[PDB]
Design an enzyme around this catalytic site. Structure first.
Site, mmCIF file in Angstrom:
data_model
loop_
_atom_site.group_PDB
_atom_site.id
_atom_site.type_symbol
_atom_site.label_atom_id
_atom_site.label_comp_id
_atom_site.label_asym_id
_atom_site.label_seq_id
_atom_site.Cartn_x
_atom_site.Cartn_y
_atom_site.Cartn_z
ATOM 1 N N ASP B 210 -2.878 -6.412 9.065
ATOM 2 C CA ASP B 210 -1.850 -6.448 8.039
ATOM 3 C C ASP B 210 -1.867 -7.756 7.268
ATOM 4 O O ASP B 210 -1.832 -8.825 7.866
ATOM 5 C CB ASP B 210 -0.488 -6.232 8.700
ATOM 6 C CG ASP B 210 0.666 -6.627 7.814
ATOM 7 O OD1 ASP B 210 1.095 -7.799 7.897
ATOM 8 O OD2 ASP B 210 1.139 -5.766 7.039
ATOM 9 N N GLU B 240 -6.072 -4.659 5.642
ATOM 10 C CA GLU B 240 -5.259 -4.022 4.621
ATOM 11 C C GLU B 240 -5.239 -4.944 3.424
ATOM 12 O O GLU B 240 -4.189 -5.427 3.024
ATOM 13 C CB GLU B 240 -3.834 -3.776 5.118
ATOM 14 C CG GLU B 240 -3.051 -2.830 4.229
ATOM 15 C CD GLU B 240 -1.966 -2.084 4.977
ATOM 16 O OE1 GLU B 240 -1.358 -1.166 4.383
ATOM 17 O OE2 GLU B 240 -1.721 -2.411 6.157
ATOM 18 N N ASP B 323 3.414 1.568 2.474
ATOM 19 C CA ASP B 323 3.772 0.580 1.463
ATOM 20 C C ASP B 323 3.965 1.233 0.099
ATOM 21 O O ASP B 323 4.559 0.642 -0.804
ATOM 22 C CB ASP B 323 2.703 -0.510 1.377
ATOM 23 C CG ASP B 323 3.212 -1.776 0.716
ATOM 24 O OD1 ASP B 323 4.032 -1.670 -0.220
ATOM 25 O OD2 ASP B 323 2.794 -2.876 1.134
#
Lengths: 486, 486
Positions: B210, B240, B323
Site C-alpha cells: 500500500d 499499489e 479506493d
C-alpha cells in the site's frame, strides 16, 4: 464444601521480583527483532545496548535464587506496556518486548519448573491503558466505537492526553492514563476471565491480583476462582488487598492476601521508634507507632483469628513491596530491626515473602525511583544474607514453622515469646526488641516437650526446669532473637 | 540474473475483497470471546448481533468465488485496527478480532488452499496508528520514549488527539491518525521485514504493498524482495503504485503493480463521454477524456512497452478498487461500457483483477461510504455476471490470452482490433465502442492462421478471404466486442 488452598503455597518461600531492575542476561540476546542480522545488530542502537533487566537475566540467575532457598517467584506486571508504565497494560496476551519474551518468559518458566520453583504473575484487571486496543478504538471512534460500554465514559469529547481538559472517562484514582474497565459489563468479565485462563494454560502457577478491591461487580472473583481452579486446581490466587480482607477470604474467591496486616505490627514492634516514617507507605500498612510485646501480641492474635485457618496457611506474609520502601531502609539502617522482622516473618504461619534485594544490604527509597534493584553488585551485607539463608533452611526443616499452630507464651515489656507446634514438634521463638539484655520466667504448661537446643538466635537465658507443669526462663541479649527446638 | 516472477500469477484471475463488507458467516461463531458460555452469549450484545462481514463469511462462500473462476483472493488490510480504520494498524501480528481471527484467517487460508486459491494480503508499512504499540510508548513517555527515533517527530509536546494543536509528528498526508514510520531507521526496516516474513511463514501467497512509493529509503524494497522470496520464492509482490512504476519494476523489487495505467485508457475508450466524472478518483487513474481507437492503441502500446515483459505478465490489471468507484457506477449504468471494459481486462497480458461486486450489477460510490459490498443480495445482473464468468472460462481456456503477445491490427474511429498470440494459437479481439454498427478491412499479414470461429462476442462481420498475405474484414454491432479463434 471444605475450604481448600494449594498445599505447596503452605510450604513455599516467596521471592518478589521487579523484572526491569533485577537482572540483565549476557550479551547474546535478540531483543526486539529476533530475526536480525548480527552484522546489522550494531546498526540498531536500542537493541545494541539495552540497560534494564530482562527475563533471560532472572533465568540466568536461578542458581542464586534457588540457593537462597526460595522456591516460588512472583513478579510485578510483565505484560506489554509503556516503556516505564508496566501497570498501564497495552496487551495482556504478550509479555513485554523489552524486558522479556513470550519466547523469553517461556524459557524462564520451563527453567524455573525443572527446579520446582513456581511462578506467579501480577494481573492488573481493574484498568488498562490509553494504548489498550479496545480503549484505543473508543479514542479513535468517539461515540461510534463498538465498545464504549466497555469503559467508564462520562460524556464526549474525551481528552486522553490533553491535561487542561476533561477527559470524560473514569481513571484509576482520577488518572487518565489508567482507563478503568466496566466490570459490570458481561463482555468485559469474559475477556478478563480468558486472560486468566490463557496464562494458566501457558504454564503459570498463580495470579497476583492488583488492587482487586476496586472490582466491585458481584460474583466476579468467585467466577475468577472457578475458571482458574478449573484449569489448574493447584493455582495460587493472591489478592494485594491492604487491610481487612475477610470479604475475599471466605474460601470462594482468593486463596489469601499479601498480609500487610502482619507487616505493619511486626515492623512497629521490631523497629519501634527506629522506623524512618518518611519511607512509610502509610497507604499500604501502618508500621507505627512503635509497639510493645503485649501490644504486638494482641494485634497479631487478632490478625490470626481473622481468617479461616486454611487460608491463613496460604497468606502471603511480607515486610516490603514494590509499592513500599525496602526493609533495610524503612528501619533506618538498623540491622537489628532487619533481623528481628525477618525472624517473625519466617516463623509466622503462611507463605513468607522476600522482596528481592532485602536478603542483602540493599536499601530502597519509597519515592518513585527507587532504585536500584540489582542485587549484585556485591559488597553484600553477608550477615543479613546469612540470617535470611539460615532462617529459610530452618523454616524448611521444621514443619511446625509452616503449618503448626501459633501460641503466645510471654509478652511483656519488649520481650515476646510464641510457640509454633505441629504434632509433637514444638518450637519457641523469642524476640527481645529492647536494648537491655532481657530475661523472663514463663509458665509453659501448654508445651508437652522442652525445647532445649538453640536453633538460631544465641540465647544465654534458657533454664528450663522440671516436667511437673513445666517452668521456663529465658535471657536474650538486647535486640536479639532465637529459635528453640529439639 | 534473469528477471523472474511467480508463474502462477501469470495465469491467475484475481478477486479483490473488502472483508468487512463481503460476507458474514452463519450464527454459530464465537466472535471476540471464544471461550464464552453460549448461555451467557446473549448477555454480550456486541457478539450477540454483529453486523459486518468476517473471514468465516468469505470461507463460507468459497464455492461462489471458485465458481466465478477466480483462483486467487487479495484483500484490503485485515490486521487489528480501529473498528473502522483498517488502515490505521494497531497490531500487525494479529488479524483483527472482529472481522476475522488469527484462528479464523487460518481456516480461510487452509480452505482456500485446498482449492488452489491463493491469498494475498495488504501490507501497510509506511504508517501505523496512534494505537500502534511503539508510537503509544512515545505518546506516553514523550521525550523519554526509547523509540522516538522510530517516527517523524518535529518537536514537543505532541498532540495526537487534540485538533487545534500542533502534533509535532509527520502523518500520512498531514494526518495525525497515521503516524509515519522512520524508514531510514535500521531497527524499523527490520521490524517491517519481519512482519512480512511472519505472514509468509503463516501461509500467505503474496503481499499487496500500500502506497509503497512513500517509503523512499534506498535499498528498502530490494531487501523486502529478498527476505520475502527467501521464505517463499513463489510469493507475489504487488505494489499499489498509481502511475509510471518503472522505478520499482526493474526486477529487483516488486513483481508488478496494480496497473492503473491500464485502467484509465481502457475506461476512457470503452465508456468515453459516458464516464460519470464525479466518481472519478482523479488521484488514482485518468479515465478521461474519452479516447478513440487510434488513441487508445497508442496509449496501450506505450503502457505495454514500459516494463520488462516478464513483469508485464505479472502485473495486476484492474478497473476498480476500494479506493475507486465501482465499474457499473463509473460508467453511469451503461452496461455496454461494463462489458467492453472487462473484455479488454480479461484479454490483456497480466493478471486480471475483479473488484468484488462488479461481476454483478452492484454499483459503488466513490465517496466514503460506499457502500454496499455484499454482493448477494441477488437481484443480480445475470448478464454481466455471465459475461464475467464466460470471459474467465475463455481466458483460462486459451493460453495466448494470458501470456501471448499483444499486436494491434486495426484501430480507427471507434473500432479497435488487437491480437493475442502464443505459439500457433492466435486470437483476434475486437471492440466497437461506437454507436453505429462498424466494419473494417484489415491487412492481417502478421497472423499465420485465420481465426474464423466466434468465441464470445457475436460478430456479424467476419469475412476472411485468402491465404496469400491474408485479408480480413470485420463488422460488429454498435457497442459490442468479440473474440475470434480456432
Amino acid at each position: 464444601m471444605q475450604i481448600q488452598t494449594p498445599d505447596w503455597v503452605k510450604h513455599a518461600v516467596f521471592y518478589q521480583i521487579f523484572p526491569d531492575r533485577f537482572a540483565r542476561s549476557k550479551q547474546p540476546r535478540k531483543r526486539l527483532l529476533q530475526e536480525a542480522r548480527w552484522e546489522d545488530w550494531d546498526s540498531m542502537p536500542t537493541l545494541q545496548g539495552y540497560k534494564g533487566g530482562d527475563l533471560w537475566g532472572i533465568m540466568e540467575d536461578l542458581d542464586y535464587i534457588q540457593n537462597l532457598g526460595i522456591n516460588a517467584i512472583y513478579f510485578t506486571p510483565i505484560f506489554q506496556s509503556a516503556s516505564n508504565h508496566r501497570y498501564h497494560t497495552h496487551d495482556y496476551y504478550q509479555v513485554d518486548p523489552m524486558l522479556g519474551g513470550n519466547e523469553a518468559f517461556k524459557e524462564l518458566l520451563d527453567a524455573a519448573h525443572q527446579r520446582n520453583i513456581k511462578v506467579v504473575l501480577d494481573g492488573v484487571f481493574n484498568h488498562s491503558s490509553r494504548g489498550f486496543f479496545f480503549f484505543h478504538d473508543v479514542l479513535e471512534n468517539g461515540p461510534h466505537s463498538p465498545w464504549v460500554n466497555w469503559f467508564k465514559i462520562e460524556g464526549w469529547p474525551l481528552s486522553p492526553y490533553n491535561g487542561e481538559f476533561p477527559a470524560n472517562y473514569v481513571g484509576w484514582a482520577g488518572n487518565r492514563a489508567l482507563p478503568e474497565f466496566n466490570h459490570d459489563n458481561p463482555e468485559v468479565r469474559e475477556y478478563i476471565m480468558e486472560i486468566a485462563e490463557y496464562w494458566l494454560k501457558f504454564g503459570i502457577d498463580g495470579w497476583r491480583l492488583d488492587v482487586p478491591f476496586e472490582i466491585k461487580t458481584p460474583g466476579f472473583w468467585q467466577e475468577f476462582r472457578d475458571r482458574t481452579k478449573a484449569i489448574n486446581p493447584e493455582a495460587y490466587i493472591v489478592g494485594e488487598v491492604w487491610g481487612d480482607s475477610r470479604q475475599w477470604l471466605d474460601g470462594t474467591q482468593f486463596d489469601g492476601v499479601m498480609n500487610y496486616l502482619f507487616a505493619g505490627p511486626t515492623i512497629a514492634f521490631a523497629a519501634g521508634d527506629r522506623v524512618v516514617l518518611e519511607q512509610v507507605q502509610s497507604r499500604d500498612y501502618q508500621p507505627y507507632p512503635p509497639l510493645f510485646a503485649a501490644e504486638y501480641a494482641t494485634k497479631i492474635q487478632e490478625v490470626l483469628q481473622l481468617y479461616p485457618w486454611e487460608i491463613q496457611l496460604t497468606q502471603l506474609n511480607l515486610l516490603a513491596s514494590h509499592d513500599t520502601a525496602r526493609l533495610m531502609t524503612i528501619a533506618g539502617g538498623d540491622i537489628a530491626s532487619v533481623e528481628l522482622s525477618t525472624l517473625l516473618l519466617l516463623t509466622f504461619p503462611g507463605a513468607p515473602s522476600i522482596y528481592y534485594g532485602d536478603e542483602v544490604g540493599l536499601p530502597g527509597g519509597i519515592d518513585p525511583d527507587s532504585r536500584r534493584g540489582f542485587p549484585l553488585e556485591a559488597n553484600w551485607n553477608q550477615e543479613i544474607f546469612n540470617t535470611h539463608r539460615q532462617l529459610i533452611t530452618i523454616r524448611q526443616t521444621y514443619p511446625a514453622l509452616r503449618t503448626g499452630d501459633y501460641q503466645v507464651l510471654y509478652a511483656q515489656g519488649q520481650l515476646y515469646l510464641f510457640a509454633r507446634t505441629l504434632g509433637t514438634e514444638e518450637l519457641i521463638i523469642a524476640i527481645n526488641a529492647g536494648t537491655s539484655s532481657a530475661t523472663a520466667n514463663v509458665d509453659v504448661a501448654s508445651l508437652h516437650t522442652q525445647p532445649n537446643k538453640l536453633l538460631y538466635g544465641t540465647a544465654e537465658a534458657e533454664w528450663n526446669g522440671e516436667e511437673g507443669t513445666q517452668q521456663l526462663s529465658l535471657t536474650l541479649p538486647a535486640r536479639s532473637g532465637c529459635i528453640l527446638g529439639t
